[PDB]
Amino acid sequence: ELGNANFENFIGATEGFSEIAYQFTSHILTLGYAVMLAGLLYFILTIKNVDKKFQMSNILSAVVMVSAFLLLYAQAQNWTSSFTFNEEVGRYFLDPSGDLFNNGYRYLNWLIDVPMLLFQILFVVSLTTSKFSSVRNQFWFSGAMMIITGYIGQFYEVSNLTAFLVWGAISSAFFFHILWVMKKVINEGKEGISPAGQKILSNIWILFLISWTLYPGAYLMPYLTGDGFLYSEDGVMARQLVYTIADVSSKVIYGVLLGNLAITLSKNKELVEA
Amino acid sequence: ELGNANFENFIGATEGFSEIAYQFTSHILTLGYAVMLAGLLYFILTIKNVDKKFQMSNILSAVVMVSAFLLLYAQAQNWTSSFTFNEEVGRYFLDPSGDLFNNGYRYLNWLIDVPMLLFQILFVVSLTTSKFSSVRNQFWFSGAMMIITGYIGQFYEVSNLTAFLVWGAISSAFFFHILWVMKKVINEGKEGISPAGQKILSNIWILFLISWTLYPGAYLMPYLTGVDGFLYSEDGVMARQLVYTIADVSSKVIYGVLLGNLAITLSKNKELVEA
Amino acid sequence: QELGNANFENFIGATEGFSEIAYQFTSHILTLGYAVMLAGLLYFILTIKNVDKKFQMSNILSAVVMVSAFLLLYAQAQNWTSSFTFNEEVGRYFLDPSGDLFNNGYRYLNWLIDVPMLLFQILFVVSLTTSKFSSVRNQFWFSGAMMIITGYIGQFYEVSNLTAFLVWGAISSAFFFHILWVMKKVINEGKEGISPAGQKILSNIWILFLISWTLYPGAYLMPYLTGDGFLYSEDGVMARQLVYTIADVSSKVIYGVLLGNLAITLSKNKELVE
Amino acid sequence: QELGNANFENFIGATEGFSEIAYQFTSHILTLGYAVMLAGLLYFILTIKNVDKKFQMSNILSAVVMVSAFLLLYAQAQNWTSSFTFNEEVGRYFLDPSGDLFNNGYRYLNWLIDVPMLLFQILFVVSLTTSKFSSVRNQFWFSGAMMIITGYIGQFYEVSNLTAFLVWGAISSAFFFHILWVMKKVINEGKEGISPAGQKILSNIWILFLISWTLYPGAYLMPYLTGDGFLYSEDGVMARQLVYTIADVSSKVIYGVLLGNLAITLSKNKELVE
Amino acid sequence: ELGNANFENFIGATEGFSEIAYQFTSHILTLGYAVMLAGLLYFILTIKNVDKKFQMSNILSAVVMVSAFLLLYAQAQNWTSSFTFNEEVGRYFLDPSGDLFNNGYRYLNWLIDVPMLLFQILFVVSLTTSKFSSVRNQFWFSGAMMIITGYIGQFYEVSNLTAFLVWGAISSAFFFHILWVMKKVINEGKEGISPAGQKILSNIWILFLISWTLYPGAYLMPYLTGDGFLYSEDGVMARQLVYTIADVSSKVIYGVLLGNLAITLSKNKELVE
Ligand SMILES: *C/C=C(C)/C=C/C=C(C)/C=C/C1=C(C)CCCC1(C)C
Ligand SMILES: *C/C=C(C)/C=C/C=C(C)/C=C/C1=C(C)CCCC1(C)C
Ligand SMILES: *C/C=C(C)/C=C/C=C(C)/C=C/C1=C(C)CCCC1(C)C
Ligand SMILES: *C/C=C(C)/C=C/C=C(C)/C=C/C1=C(C)CCCC1(C)C
Ligand SMILES: *C/C=C(C)/C=C/C=C(C)/C=C/C1=C(C)CCCC1(C)C
Ligand code: NA
Ligand code: NA
Ligand code: NA
Ligand code: NA
Ligand code: NA
Q: C-alpha distances in angstroms, A231 versus A15, A16, A159, A228, B160?
A: 11, 12, 14, 6, 51
CA-CA distance, E116 to E130, in Å (whole number)? 19
Packed helices D20-47 and E104-120: angle between N→C axes, nearest 10 degrees: 30
Residues whose CB is less than 8 angstroms from the CB of residue E188 and which lie 6 or more positions away in sequence, other chains included: E125, E126, E127, E128, E129, E130
Residue closest to E71 by CA, chosen among C34, D29, D19: D29
Burial code (b: 16+ CB inside 10 Å, e: under 16) for C149-188 equals bbbbbbbbbbbbeeeebbebbebbbebbebbbebbebbbb
Count of C-beta atoms within a 10 Å radius of residue A226: 9
| Ligand lying closest to the C-alpha of residue A12 | 6
Q: Which of A19, A93, A264, A267 to mutate to test the interface with D (most CBs of D within 10 A)?
A: A19
Residue closest to A121 by CA, chosen among A143, A89, A145, A92: A143
Radius of gyration of chain A (CA): 20
| Ligand 4, atom 7, residue with closest C-alpha | D216
Whether B167 lines ligand 2, by a CB cut-off of 6 Å, is: no
Task: Considering only the beta carbons, identify the residue of A24, A45, A85 that sits closest to D100.
Answer: A85
CA-CA distance, C222 to D257, in Å (whole number)? 55
Whether C23 lines ligand 3, by a CB cut-off of 6 Å, is: no
Angle at B72 between CA B69 and CA B73, to 5 degrees: 75
Q: C-alpha distances in angstroms, A71 versus A147, B65, D107, E94?
A: 15, 17, 22, 37
CB contact under 8 A, E47 and D47: no
CA-CA distance, A120 to A140, in Å (whole number)? 12
Count of C-beta atoms within a 10 Å radius of residue D36: 27
CA-CA distance, A74 to A95, in Å (whole number)? 17
What are residue B91's DSSP bridge partners?
Answer: B86
CA-CA distance, D263 to D259, in Å (whole number)? 6
User: Which CATH code is given to the segment(s) A1-274?
Assistant: 1.20.1070.10
Residue D202 belongs to what H/E stretch? Answer: helix D196-220
SS3 C162: helix
Residue A85 belongs to what H/E stretch? Answer: strand A83-86
**Resolution attained, angstroms:** 3.0
CA A124 and chain centroid, separation: 21
| Best residue among D147, D181, D215, D255 to mutate for probing ligand 4, ranked by most atoms within 8 Å of CB | D147
Count of C-beta atoms within a 10 Å radius of residue A162: 8
Residue type at position C270: K
Residue closest to A224 by CA, chosen among A238, A212, A209, A243: A238
Contacts of A109 in chain B (CB under 8 A): 31, 34
| Best residue among C111, C140, C141, C205 to mutate for probing ligand 3, ranked by most atoms within 8 Å of CB | C111
Q: Contact, D2 vs A87, CB < 8 A?
A: yes
Question: Could you tell me which chain B residue has the CA closest to the CA of C261?
Answer: B56
Whether B147 lines ligand 2, by a CB cut-off of 6 Å, is: yes
What are residue D18's DSSP bridge partners?
Answer: D93
| Shortest CA gap B78–chain C (Å) | 11
CA-CA distance, C80 to C65, in Å (whole number)? 22
Chains A and D touch (3+ CB pairs under 8 A): yes
Q: What is the DSSP letter of C273?
A: T
Whether B117 lines ligand 2, by a CB cut-off of 6 Å, is: yes
Find chains touching chain C: ≥3 CB pairs under 8 Å: B, E
Domain ranges of chain B: 1-275
CA D217 and chain centroid, separation: 11
Residue type at position C116: P
Whether E143 lines ligand 5, by a CB cut-off of 6 Å, is: no
What are residue C87's DSSP bridge partners?
Answer: C92
Residue A256 belongs to what H/E stretch? Answer: helix A254-265
Pinpoint the alpha helices (H) of C122-249. 133-154, 162-191, 196-220, 234-248
Q: Contact, E264 vs E195, CB < 8 A?
A: no
Q: C-alpha distances in angstroms, D230 versus D9, D15, D165, D225, D245?
A: 14, 16, 20, 9, 21
CA A2 and chain centroid, separation: 27
Residue closest to C57 by CA, chosen among E263, E120, B24, B179: E263
B86: left (phi over 0), alpha (psi -120 to 50) or beta: beta
Q: Contact, D202 vs D265, CB < 8 A?
A: no
CB contact under 8 A, D20 and E3: yes
CA B5 and chain centroid, separation: 21
Helix (H) and strand (E) counts in chain D: 10, 2
Residue A84 belongs to what H/E stretch? Answer: strand A83-86
Count of C-beta atoms within a 10 Å radius of residue A10: 18
Question: Could you tell me which chain A residue has the CA closest to the CA of B45?
Answer: A59
Residue B162 belongs to what H/E stretch? Answer: helix B161-190
Chain E contacts to C (CB-CB under 8 A): 18-20, 22-24, 26-28, 30-31, 33-35, 37-42, 45-46, 49, 80, 84-92, 268, 270-273
Residue D92 belongs to what H/E stretch? Answer: strand D92-95
Packed helices D196-220 and D133-155: angle between N→C axes, nearest 10 degrees: 20
Q: C-alpha distances in angstroms, D244 versus D107, D120, D210, D239?
A: 9, 22, 15, 9
Distance (angstroms) between ligand 7 centre and the Cα of B234 equals 15
Angle at C38 between CA C32 and CA C39, to 5 degrees: 80
CA-CA distance, D100 to B131, in Å (whole number)? 63
C268: left (phi over 0), alpha (psi -120 to 50) or beta: left
CA C37 and chain centroid, separation: 11
CA-CA distance, B265 to E178, in Å (whole number)? 60
Helix (H) and strand (E) counts in chain C: 9, 2
CA-CA distance, A215 to A244, in Å (whole number)? 10
Q: Contact, B120 vs B60, CB < 8 A?
A: yes
Q: What is the DSSP letter of D18?
A: B
Q: Contact, D260 vs D47, CB < 8 A?
A: yes
Backbone angles phi, psi at D30, to 5 degrees: -70, -35
Q: What is the DSSP letter of B83?
A: E
What are residue D84's DSSP bridge partners?
Answer: D95
| Shortest CA gap B140–chain A (Å) | 31
SS3 C236: helix
Residue type at position A273: E
| Shortest CA gap C97–chain E (Å) | 5
| Best residue among E116, E215, E256 to mutate for probing ligand 5, ranked by most atoms within 8 Å of CB | E215
Task: Considering only the beta carbons, identify the residue of B3, B64, B107 that sits closest to C91.
Answer: B3
CA-CA distance, E90 to E96, in Å (whole number)? 19
**Dihedral sign (CA E226, E232, E236, E237):** negative
CA E116 and chain centroid, separation: 12
Backbone angles phi, psi at D86, to 5 degrees: -65, 130
Burial class for B171, CB neighbours closer than 10 Å (0-12, 13-18, 19+): buried
CA-CA distance, C202 to C190, in Å (whole number)? 8
| Ligand 5, atom 14, residue with closest C-alpha | E172
Distance (angstroms) between ligand 4 centre and the Cα of C108 equals 49
Q: Contact, E252 vs E120, CB < 8 A?
A: no
Q: In 3-state terms, chain B is what percent helix, strand and coil (to 5)?
A: 75, 5, 20
Whether E251 lines ligand 5, by a CB cut-off of 6 Å, is: yes
Half-sphere exposure in the Cβ direction for B81 (13 Å, CA): 17
Whether C33 lines ligand 3, by a CB cut-off of 6 Å, is: no
CA E226 and chain centroid, separation: 25
**Gaps after which residues in chain B, C–N over 2.5 Å?**
none
CA-CA distance, B233 to B245, in Å (whole number)? 19
Residue closest to E239 by CA, chosen among E149, E180, E179, E158: E158
Give DSSP secondary structure letters for A14-82. Answer: TT-B-HHHHHHHHHHHHHHHHHHHHHHHHHHHHGGGS-GGGHHHHHHHHHHHHHHHHHHHHHHHHHHHH
Residues whose CB is less than 8 angstroms from the CB of residue D162 and which lie 6 or more positions away in sequence, other chains included: D224
Q: In 3-state terms, chain C is what percent helix, strand and coil (to 5)?
A: 75, 5, 20
3-state secondary structure chain E: CCCCCCHHHHHHHCCCECHHHHHHHHHHHHHHHHHHHHHHHHHHHHHHHCCHHHHHHHHHHHHHHHHHHHHHHHHHHHHHHHEEEECCCCEEEECCCCCCCCCHHHHHHHHHHHHHHHHHHHHCCCCCCCCHHHHHHHHHHHHHHHHHHHHHHHHHCCCCHHHHHHHHHHHHHHHHHHHHHHHHHHHHHHCCCCHHHHHHHHHHHHHHHHHHHHHHHHHCHHHCCCCCCCCCHHHHHHHHHHHHHHHHHHHHHHHHHHHHHHHHHCCCCCCCC
| Ligand 3, atom 7, residue with closest C-alpha | C216
Please give the biggest Cα pair distance in chain D: 66
Half-sphere exposure in the Cβ direction for C108 (13 Å, CA): 25
**Dihedral sign (CA C54, C58, C59, C64):** positive
Q: What is the DSSP letter of A269?
A: T
Question: Could you tell me which chain D residue has the CA closest to the CA of E51?
Answer: D272
Packed helices B195-219 and B234-248: angle between N→C axes, nearest 10 degrees: 150
Residue closest to B82 by CA, chosen among B29, B12, B3: B12
The residue count of chain E comes to: 273
User: Which CATH code is given to the segment(s) E1-273?
Assistant: 1.20.1070.10
CA-CA distance, A243 to A71, in Å (whole number)? 13
Residues with CB under 6 A from ligand 1: A 110, 113-114, 117, 146-147, 150, 168, 171-172, 175, 212, 215-216, 219, 247, 250-251
CA-CA distance, D41 to D58, in Å (whole number)? 13
Q: C-alpha distances in angstroms, C202 versus C115, C182, C196, C198, C205?
A: 18, 14, 10, 6, 5
Residue closest to E87 by CA, chosen among C102, C83, C158, C96: C96
Count of C-beta atoms within a 10 Å radius of residue A148: 18
Q: Contact, E51 vs E261, CB < 8 A?
A: no
CA-CA distance, D179 to C192, in Å (whole number)? 71
Q: Contact, C163 vs C193, CB < 8 A?
A: no
CB contact under 8 A, C156 and E91: no
Count of C-beta atoms within a 10 Å radius of residue C87: 15
Long-range pairs of E268-271 with CB within 8 A, sequence gap ≥ 24: E268/C53, E268/E49, E269/E196, E270/C53, E270/C54, E271/C53, E271/C54, E271/C56, E271/C57, E271/E46, E271/E49
Whether E175 lines ligand 5, by a CB cut-off of 6 Å, is: yes
| Best residue among A102, A215, A224 to mutate for probing ligand 1, ranked by most atoms within 8 Å of CB | A215
Residues whose CB is less than 8 angstroms from the CB of residue E102 and which lie 6 or more positions away in sequence, other chains included: D20, D24, D28, E5, E6, E78
Q: Contact, B118 vs B132, CB < 8 A?
A: no
Angle at B261 between CA B259 and CA B265, to 5 degrees: 120
Q: C-alpha distances in angstroms, D94 versus A103, B232, D86, D242, E12?
A: 33, 50, 6, 20, 22
CA-CA distance, C241 to C235, in Å (whole number)? 10
Residue closest to C202 by CA, chosen among C185, C217, C214: C185
CA-CA distance, A146 to A167, in Å (whole number)? 9
Residues whose CB is less than 8 angstroms from the CB of residue B246 and which lie 6 or more positions away in sequence, other chains included: B211, B214
Burial class for C228, CB neighbours closer than 10 Å (0-12, 13-18, 19+): exposed
Residue D133 belongs to what H/E stretch? Answer: helix D133-155
Q: Contact, B69 vs B33, CB < 8 A?
A: yes
Angle at D173 between CA D170 and CA D176, to 5 degrees: 165
**Dihedral sign (CA E115, E117, E120, E125):** negative
B131: left (phi over 0), alpha (psi -120 to 50) or beta: beta
Radius of gyration of chain B (CA): 20
The beta strands (E) that lie in B37-158 are given as 83-86, 91-94
The span from the first CA to the last CA of chain B, in angstroms, equals: 58
CA-CA distance, E113 to C52, in Å (whole number)? 33
Query: Which residues crowd ion ligand 6, with CB under 5 Å?
Result: A 80, 84; D 100
CA-CA distance, E28 to E241, in Å (whole number)? 6
CA-CA distance, D63 to A70, in Å (whole number)? 19
CATH superfamily of domain region B1-275:
Rhodopsin 7-helix transmembrane proteins (1.20.1070.10)
Q: Which of D37, D64, D113 to mutate to test the interface with A (most CBs of A within 10 A)?
A: D64
Whether B151 lines ligand 2, by a CB cut-off of 6 Å, is: no
